[PDB]
DNA sequence: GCTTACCGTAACTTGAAAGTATTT
DNA sequence: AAATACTTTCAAGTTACGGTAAGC
């Protein structure tokens, strides 16, 4: 009622005429808030669009026995119901817009040809490879499949940038990571969450574990029973969730034999790799009575080394 | 606020019945029903603050003149207890308007006037320990 | 100037704010019970009550004894019976612990709490910057303009606390809107390359009178059009008046509690202001002057990602483009230059591209 | 030869804000 | 057509893995 415009004539509600700064600003090129949101079209809208297009698009006989295949602007759009139809239908375009499920064989051709063509003129490649698509869809697939847009490696120079941003944009405990990723080059929210929470924090402690820390960790685990490590992290003085989980599970457990191998455990490990698989170690360790997940992988590598 | 007014009216009636008001006698009910455990529900911070402010506002509402002379003193005791046992770091505070203050002071001086110094000293201590927010109106206002 | 209800439960009759503040200070400060100082004691306080309350000393001693505070397992719900609240809380906690694996402070709850309570109890590093003892505190509500579809049903708002002795312009400066950072020219055949602070001219509307900003020479006046139109022939809004904004402070502003006043800045962008709950300064709130105004509430708006990557945030918006399926399609800086340029601007001629400073990242 | 912290991503998860199919 | 619902998304995290570059 009182939102926009605030001043509306009681009888009519037109609102005051345009300002001077308003007309100048619109003439410059700046866009309002309402110009960047557009309503989406429901299913019935698409059905009506298609049937109107079909109806619009001996000869007396030709009219009436027309098959639905062969046939398949302001007049329609205004009187029946206005340039999105000129784009929606031309880009929905039942006859020739078929973004079918991408079979695996087309992906290799798309990637190789995109790399060899210089990653340019996407209309040209989308017309060269003859893939029944558009230029946009090829680029979307190439970007979703791309393996060169991220970094996945933390250097010295970008840790400092992360620290500066998270120290100038931290209100209380609230840390907005997405605004940082906007200010942080070539990253995303997941990697910043990982880095700050696990490694880059000034508060956290990085070093060896003393027996007193071990005793406190054992008491905390016996309190909580090997679940909810984010709660357990509180008892241990400053160690992170990942440190506590990894240390307790794969280093400190009550019964996990460690040290040099023998012949019999080698027997079981080799057979079990040849049976449950070679690429996964969780199950391989799960059946092995003593050794853990990491130890089986290390031992297999040492086997390969010996060979 | 899951039905506070039920417990509030229960305690206020159980103390109305006596007609022998004194802080020796209200604290007996406060410990016999142990109303001081109402703030030990293992709650977070936001719910803690909201619950405390709702309880204090309700007790204040019950303090005002349009009640009897018996409810008002019990509600004053309830204000004292709730403000004193709330578990908050920046303790939430009761909300006094402007149209109330003159009559509140009149009631206080009338209560001091006749040898009833218990509630008198209670109110004086509440005022002296800077427990109030002096606002134009009791509740926040906005169209919707 | 007693502030009472005009409408039944929602509105307050107008009142000169300064008179209200002076009325409180005169009515209450005479006893010395509002001060901004953080804190044989027994018998001395006993003499104090025996002299102020004016009861014989015996009764004062008896009361200072029997009142006390002790007469009236921390976070555990006991078996206590006659507490409906405890029963309900216990049931909810049990149902919560049996139906959740990972329970902690969610992002929204911690956001709102750590936003509202992140300055209380602060003290001025300087000593000459501390707030006075009797100055007021006003809470204002500033509604967002509509940015998404849903804001048309449950429109959001932002809240900030403004003192009673500082001018209007110190709130005009601190109202954060994205429409002070829009730069979008038209970059189509020039991919590489002042802001919307070239022209800055705004105004308030409080109880009929317009407050304009004529500090620096610009297209300063903005309330002339409404004065021209809405009252010469309409005969519907009485009479308005002008007064330069940088001349008045908040005490002079005769207002009402809970009414939608106006704030129009940068042409036609309009925010609806709903002032509520003015009070006196306590000794707990952040005692300072260079932090006010400060905001204690905000909205966690979403962010727009590029239509192709769906991994970065949008930086360029293209209108009337022959590639994309939708008309206002947004892009990052990689998709744009990788799809729209063949080592040269405007691969296809019918193509408009503008920079796009999204609100979700600037709020 | 072995062990020991560190490293980094895939996939779940809690829940308000925002979409949107249906109601009289 | 106002009002009501259900199901999407967004953005903090949290957990379970796969390896690394070290140590004696
Ligand atoms: Zn604005
Ligand atoms: Zn992109």
Residue C278 belongs to domain with CATH number: 3.10.290
Ligand number nearest CA of C329 is: 2
Whether the CB of C72 is below 8 Å from some CB of chain A: the reply is no
Of the candidates C52, C72, C92, which is a domain's last residue?
C72
Q: Which of C148, C199, C323 minimises the CB distance to A135?
A: C323
The C-alpha atoms of residue A273 and residue A291 are separated, in whole angstroms, by: 14
Q: How far is C298 from chain B (nearest CA, A)?
A: 16
Residue C184 to residue A30, Cβ atoms within 8 A: yes
Asked if strand D comes closer than 7 Å to C137 Cβ, the answer is no
Is the distance from CB of C158 to CB of C174 less than 8 angstroms?
A: no
Neighbours of C239 (CB within 10 A): 8
Residue B99 to residue C49, Cβ atoms within 8 A: no
The C-alpha atoms of residue A131 and residue A99 are separated, in whole angstroms, by: 10
Q: What ranges in chain A are assigned the alpha helix state H? A: 20-28, 43-56, 59-64, 68-71, 74, 84-92, 104-116, 122-128, 135-145, 156-168, 177-183, 189-195, 211-224, 229-235, 241-250, 263-276, 282-287, 293-306
Answer yes or no: do C186 and C145 share one domain: yes
Burial (CB < 10 A; 0-12, 13-18, 19+), residue A249, is: middle
Residue C141's beta-bridge partner residues?
A: C159
> E strands within C148-287?
157-163, 203-206, 209-212, 241-244, 260-265, 269-274, 276-280
The C-alpha atoms of residue B39 and residue C86 are separated, in whole angstroms, by: 9
Q: How far is CA A185 from CA A204, C212, C312, in A?
A: 25, 42, 10
Angle made by CA atoms C133, C136, C141, in degrees to the nearest 5: 145
Asked if strand E comes closer than 7 Å to A197 Cβ, the answer is yes
Q: Which of residues 3-42 of A touch strand E (CB under 7 A)?
A: none
Is the distance from CB of A248 to CB of A240 less than 8 angstroms?
A: no
Domains of chain A, residue spans: 1-97, 104-145, 156-200, 211-250, 263-306
Q: How far is CA B3 from CA B51, C84, C329, in A?
A: 11, 7, 52
The C-alpha atoms of residue C7 and residue B135 are separated, in whole angstroms, by: 19
| Of B3, B53, B46, B7, nearest in space to B30 by CA | B7
Angle made by CA atoms C64, B22, B127, in degrees to the nearest 5: 55
C259 contacts in chain B (CB < 8 Å): 143
Distance from CA(A283) to C1'(E18), angstroms, rounded? 13
The C-alpha atoms of residue C6 and residue B143 are separated, in whole angstroms, by: 13
Question: Helix or strand or coil: residue C355?
Answer: strand
Residue B42 to residue C76, Cβ atoms within 8 A: yes
Distance from CA(C302) to C1'(E15), angstroms, rounded? 27
Answer yes or no: do C197 and C324 share one domain: no
Residue A200 tokens, joined = 């880059």
Residue C270 to residue A140, Cβ atoms within 8 A: no
Residue B121 to residue C60, Cβ atoms within 8 A: yes
The C-alpha atoms of residue C340 and residue C323 are separated, in whole angstroms, by: 8
Residue C157 CA to ligand 1 centre (angstroms)? 12
Residue C162's beta-bridge partner residues?
A: C138
Torsion of CA A71, A75, A78, A84, to 10 degrees: 50
| Of B141, B101, A3, nearest in space to C255 by CA | B141
Residue with the two structure tokens 């007609």: B19
**Nucleotide showing the shortest C1' distance to residue A306 CA:** D1
Size of interface A-C (CB pairs under 8 A): 151
Number of domains comprising chain C? 3
Residue with the two structure tokens 């406190």: A216
Distance from CA(A273) to C1'(E19), angstroms, rounded? 18
Residue B59 tokens, joined = 């007790």
| Of A245, B1, A162, nearest in space to C85 by CA | B1
Task: Tell me the HSE value of A82 on the side-chain side, using a 13 A CA sphere.
Answer: 10
Most A CBs within 10 Å, among C150, C291, C311, C358, to test the A interface: C311
Determination technique for this PDB entry? cryo-EM
Asked if strand D comes closer than 7 Å to C100 Cβ, the answer is yes
Residues in C 186-225 with any Cβ partner in A closer than 8 A:
186, 196, 199, 201, 205, 219, 222, 225
Residue A45: φ, ψ to 5°: -60, -45
Q: Give the DSSP H/E element, type plus range, for residue B95.
A: strand B94-96
Residue A110 tokens, joined = 């798309």
Residue with the two structure tokens 């008309």: C327
Cβ contacts of C204-207, under 8 Å, gap ≥ 24:
C204/C168, C204/C172, C204/C245, C204/C261, C204/C262, C204/C263, C204/C273, C205/A6, C205/C261, C205/C262, C205/C263, C205/C264, C206/C253, C206/C254, C206/C255, C206/C261, C207/C14, C207/C253, C207/C254, C207/C255, C207/C256, C207/C261
Peptide bond into C305 cis (omega under 30): no
Residue B2 tokens, joined = 């899951």
Asked if strand D comes closer than 7 Å to A292 Cβ, the answer is no
Q: How far is B136 from chain C (nearest CA, A)?
A: 6
Residue C276's beta-bridge partner residues?
A: C139
Asked if strand D comes closer than 7 Å to C27 Cβ, the answer is no
Q: Which of C11, C20, C121 minimises the CB distance to B136?
A: C20
Question: Helix or strand or coil: residue B21?
Answer: coil
Residue C138's beta-bridge partner residues?
A: C162
Q: How far is CA A64 from CA A51, A68, A94, B69, B90, in A?
A: 15, 11, 22, 93, 82
Chain B residue whose CA is closest to C153: B144
Q: Give the DSSP H/E element, type plus range, for residue C141.
A: strand C136-143
Is the distance from CB of A238 to CB of A231 less than 8 angstroms?
A: no
| A225 phi-psi bin (left φ>0, alpha ψ -120 to 50, beta other) | left
Is the distance from CB of C287 to CB of C131 less than 8 angstroms?
A: yes
Name the residue closest to the C1' of E16 by its CA.
Answer: A282
Q: How far is B3 from chain C (nearest CA, A)?
A: 7
Residue C255's beta-bridge partner residues?
A: C15
Residue A87's beta-bridge partner residues?
A: none
* CA C102 to the chain's CA centroid: 33
CATH second-level architecture of A263-306? Answer: Orthogonal Bundle (1.10)
Answer yes or no: do C270 and C130 share one domain: yes
Task: Tell me the HSE value of A252 on the side-chain side, using a 13 A CA sphere.
Answer: 18
Residue A291 CA to ligand 1 centre (angstroms)? 64
Instruction: Calculate helix-pair angle for C57-66, C41-52, nearest 10 degrees.
Output: 120
Q: How far is A279 from chain C (nearest CA, A)?
A: 30
Is the distance from CB of A291 to CB of A269 less than 8 angstroms?
A: yes
Residue C16: φ, ψ to 5°: -60, 115
Is the distance from CB of C312 to CB of C171 less than 8 angstroms?
A: no
Residue C312 CA to ligand 2 centre (angstroms)? 6
Question: Helix or strand or coil: residue C354?
Answer: strand
Distance from CA(A299) to C1'(D7), angstroms, rounded? 21
Most C CBs within 10 Å, among B30, B41, B88, B116, to test the C interface: B41
The C-alpha atoms of residue B34 and residue B31 are separated, in whole angstroms, by: 4
The C-alpha atoms of residue A9 and residue A260 are separated, in whole angstroms, by: 90
Residue C331's beta-bridge partner residues?
A: C316
Residue C264 CA to ligand 1 centre (angstroms)? 7
The C-alpha atoms of residue A109 and residue A281 are separated, in whole angstroms, by: 35
Q: Which of B3, B46, B137 minimises the CB distance to C84?
A: B3
Residue C263's beta-bridge partner residues?
A: C204, C271
Is the distance from CB of C27 to CB of C35 less than 8 angstroms?
A: no
The whole domain housing C223 covers: 110-295
Q: Which of C226, C327, C361 minimises the CB distance to A182?
A: C361
Residue with the two structure tokens 């090129």: A29
Is the distance from CB of C122 to CB of C109 less than 8 angstroms?
A: no
| Of B7, A306, B44, nearest in space to C88 by CA | B7
Of the candidates C55, C72, C89, which is a domain's last residue?
C72
Distance from CA(A207) to C1'(D5), angstroms, rounded? 8
- Please name the residues in contact with A166: beta carbons below 8 A apart, sequence gap of 6 or more: A175, A180, A196
- Please name the residues in contact with A130: beta carbons below 8 A apart, sequence gap of 6 or more: none
Residue C226 tokens, joined = 């409404």
Residue A31 to residue C354, Cβ atoms within 8 A: yes
Ligand number nearest CA of C314 is: 2
A172 contacts in chain C (CB < 8 Å): 113-115, 117-118
Residue with the two structure tokens 């199950």: A283
Residue A35 to residue C328, Cβ atoms within 8 A: yes
| Of C340, C338, C342, nearest in space to C351 by CA | C340
Residue A145 tokens, joined = 């499949």
Burial (CB < 10 A; 0-12, 13-18, 19+), residue A42, is: exposed
In a domain, C229, yes or no: yes
The C-alpha atoms of residue C294 and residue B81 are separated, in whole angstroms, by: 34
Asked if strand E comes closer than 7 Å to A280 Cβ, the answer is yes
Residue C279 to residue B136, Cβ atoms within 8 A: yes
Is the distance from CB of C351 to CB of C320 less than 8 angstroms?
A: yes
Q: What ranges in chain C are assigned the alpha helix state H? A: 17-28, 41-52, 57-66, 84-97, 107-116, 169-172, 224-229, 333-339, 359-362
Answer yes or no: do C166 and C197 share one domain: yes
The C-alpha atoms of residue A245 and residue A109 are separated, in whole angstroms, by: 44
Peptide bond into C189 cis (omega under 30): no
The C-alpha atoms of residue C316 and residue A307 are separated, in whole angstroms, by: 57
Q: Give the DSSP H/E element, type plus range, for residue C142.
A: strand C136-143
Q: What is the resolution of this structure in A?
A: 3.5
C105 contacts in chain B (CB < 8 Å): 44
Is the distance from CB of C352 to CB of C318 less than 8 angstroms?
A: yes
């Amino acid at each position: 009622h009182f939102m926009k415009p605030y001043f509306k004539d009681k009888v009519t509600g037109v609102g005051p005429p345009a300002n001077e700064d308003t007309r100048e600003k619109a003439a410059q090129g700046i866009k309002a808030f309402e110009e960047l949101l557009v309503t989406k079209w429901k299913n019935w809208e698409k059905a009506l669009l298609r049937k109107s297009v079909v109806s619009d698009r001996k000869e007396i006989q030709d009219i009436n026995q027309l098959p639905e295949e062969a046939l398949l602007w302001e007049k329609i759009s205004n009187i029946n119901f206005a340039e999105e139809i000129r784009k929606f239908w031309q880009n929905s375009e039942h006859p020739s817009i078929n973004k079918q499920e991408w079979s695996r064989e087309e992906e290799e051709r798309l990637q190789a040809i995109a790399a060899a063509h210089g990653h340019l003129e996407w209309q040209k490649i989308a017309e060269e490879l003859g893939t029944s698509r558009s230029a946009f869809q090829c680029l979307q697939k190439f970007q979703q499949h791309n393996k060169a847009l991220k970094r996945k490696e933390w250097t010295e120079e970008e840790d400092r940038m992360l620290t500066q941003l998270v120290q100038e944009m931290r209100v209380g405990s609230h840390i907005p990571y997405r605004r940082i990723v906007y200010y942080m080059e070539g990253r995303d929210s997941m990697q910043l969450i990982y880095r700050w929470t696990k490694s880059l924090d000034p508060g956290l402690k990085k070093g060896y574990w003393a027996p007193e820390e071990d005793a406190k960790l054992l008491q905390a685990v016996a309190k909580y029973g090997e679940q909810d490590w984010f709660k357990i992290r509180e008892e241990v003085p400053g160690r992170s969730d990942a440190q506590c989980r990894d240390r307790y599970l794969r280093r400190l457990h009550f019964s996990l034999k460690k040290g040099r191998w023998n012949l019999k455990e080698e027997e079981q490990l080799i057979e079990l790799i040849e049976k449950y698989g070679v690429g996964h170690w969780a199950k391989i360790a799960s059946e092995l009575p003593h050794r853990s997940g990491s130890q089986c992988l290390s031992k297999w590598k040492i086997m390969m080394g010996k060979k | 606020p899951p039905g506070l007014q039920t417990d509030c009216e229960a305690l206020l009636s159980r103390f109305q019945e006596t007609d022998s008001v004194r802080f020796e006698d209200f604290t007996e009910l406060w410990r016999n029903m142990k109303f001081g455990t109402i703030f030990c529900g293992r709650m977070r911070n936001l719910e803690k603050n909201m619950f405390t402010k709702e309880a204090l506002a309700l007790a204040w509402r019950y303090f005002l003149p349009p009640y009897t002379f018996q409810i008002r003193v019990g509600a004053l005791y309830l204000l004292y207890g709730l403000y004193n046992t709330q578990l908050c770091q920046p303790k939430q505070k009761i909300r006094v308007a402007l149209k109330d203050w003159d009559e509140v002071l009149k009631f206080q001086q009338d209560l001091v006037n006749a040898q009833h110094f218990d509630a008198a000293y209670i109110f004086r201590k509440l005022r002296l320990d800077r427990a109030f927010h002096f606002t134009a109106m009791p509740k926040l206002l906005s169209y919707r | 100037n007693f502030p009472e209800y005009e409408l039944p439960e929602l509105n307050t009759r107008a009142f000169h704010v300064g008179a209200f503040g002076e009325l409180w200070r005169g009515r209450l400060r005479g006893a010395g019970d509002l001060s901004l100082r953080e804190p044989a004691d027994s018998d001395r306080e006993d003499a104090a009550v025996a002299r102020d309350l004016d009861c014989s000393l015996e009764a004062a001693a008896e009361l200072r004894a029997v009142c006390g505070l002790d007469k009236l397992d921390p976070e555990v719900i006991p078996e206590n019976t006659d507490l409906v609240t405890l029963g309900v809380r216990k049931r909810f906690l049990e149902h919560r612990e049996e139906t959740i694996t990972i329970d902690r402070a969610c992002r929204q709850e911690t956001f709102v709490y750590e936003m509202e309570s992140h300055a209380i109890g602060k003290k001025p590093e300087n000593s000459a910057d501390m707030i006075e003892e009797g100055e007021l505190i006003l809470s204002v509500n500033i509604l967002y303009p509509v940015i998404f579809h849903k804001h048309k049903e449950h429109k959001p708002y932002q809240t900030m606390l403004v003192l009673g002795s500082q001018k209007l312009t110190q709130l005009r400066d601190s109202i954060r809107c994205v429409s002070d950072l829009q730069i979008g020219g038209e970059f189509s055949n020039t991919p590489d390359q002042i802001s919307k602070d070239l022209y800055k001219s705004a105004f308030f509307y409080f109880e009929g009178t317009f407050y304009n900003d004529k500090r620096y020479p610009e297209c300063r006046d903005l309330s002339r059009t409404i004065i021209e139109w809405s009252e010469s022939h309409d005969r519907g809004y009485g009479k308005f008046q002008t007064a330069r904004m940088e001349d008045f402070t908040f005490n002079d502003l005769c207002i009402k509690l809970g009414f939608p006043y106006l704030y129009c800045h940068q042409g036609d962008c309009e925010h609806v202001i709903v002032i509520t709950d003015i009070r006196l300064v306590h000794h707990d709130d952040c005692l300072d002057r260079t932090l006010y105004p400060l905001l204690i509430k905000k909205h966690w708006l979403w962010t727009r990602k590029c239509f192709v990557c769906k991994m970065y945030t949008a930086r360029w918006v293209t209108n009337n483009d022959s590639f994309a399926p939708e008309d206002p399609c947004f892009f990052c800086d990689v998709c744009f230059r990788m799809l729209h340029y063949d080592s040269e601007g405007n691969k296809l001629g019918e193509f408009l591209a503008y920079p796009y400073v999204d609100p979700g990242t600037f709020n």
